[PDB]
Amino acid sequence: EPLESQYQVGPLLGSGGFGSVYSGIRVSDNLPVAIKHVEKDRISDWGELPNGTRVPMEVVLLKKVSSGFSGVIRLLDWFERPDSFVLILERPEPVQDLFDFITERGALQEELARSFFWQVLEAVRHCHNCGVLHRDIKDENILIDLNRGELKLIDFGSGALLKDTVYTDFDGTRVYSPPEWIRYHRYHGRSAAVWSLGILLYDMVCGDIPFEHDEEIIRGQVFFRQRVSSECQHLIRWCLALRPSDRPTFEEIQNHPWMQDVLLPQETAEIHLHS
Ligand SMILES: C[C@H]1CN(c2ccncc2NC(=O)c2ccc(F)c(-c3c(F)cccc3F)n2)C[C@@H](N)[C@@H]1O
To answer: Are 45 and 160 in contact (CB under 8 A)?
Structure first.
């Protein structure tokens, strides 16, 4: 029933502002897992389970979206400790985050970016449909199940319940944050998500993010350092509209002509990954 009984701990996979994440194995069936530790002091956002249990928001959010859809990393279990929480997540194998994948490969071919970006959109739509706002969409928070060509969202530790009124708090990644946050410390959920998705898509097809400093975010002028089709450039600049209400809805993104004829995930692994 206790934690270090149920799970054999492997090596540290990474650590940072989000806590420390370890490789692990469930002792019962040898299922691969990832084990995330977060100190209570560094959790600012605390939700409630139906049954009134105080927990990090992250646990609330992952329970809200943890089902059969494989586009979000599944929370398998969690534990409170006197000074920390521990989360057990599913772990694909082999696996690589999108940041490392892009660092290795450089700018992605458009066919590949289309497939990946499409899966990210399906995953984010599912979160929103379940009342969950991720608030830190970026290559480091997206993982690739290399054998299946399937992407998964991870790290809901900066997320929130989706609402229709203004957010005035933010602790996600600043270079993916929209100009209205930089200037006014205010944003609305969906349109801020769409801006981060513009940053991500640019990142995929150029191999780096378009803006580094506040003043570039605010100016919002996009320069393409690699050859990118006119239709892709158009979608990117739409997502990155300075006025939030000028940005496309998710439906508009998925109906964009650059988004048509997406590869299936398995086709994507065969053409682009196993190779
Ligand atoms: C090591 C990963 C940890 N990661 C996270 C940051 C904040 N919260 C959670 C995570 N990771 C996970 O929740 C998770 C769940 C299942 C996984 F399979 C992985 C994972 C892994 F187990 C190996 C390589 C990468 C992964 F994302 N991470 C950031 C990635 N930039 C890094 O890479």
So the answer is: yes
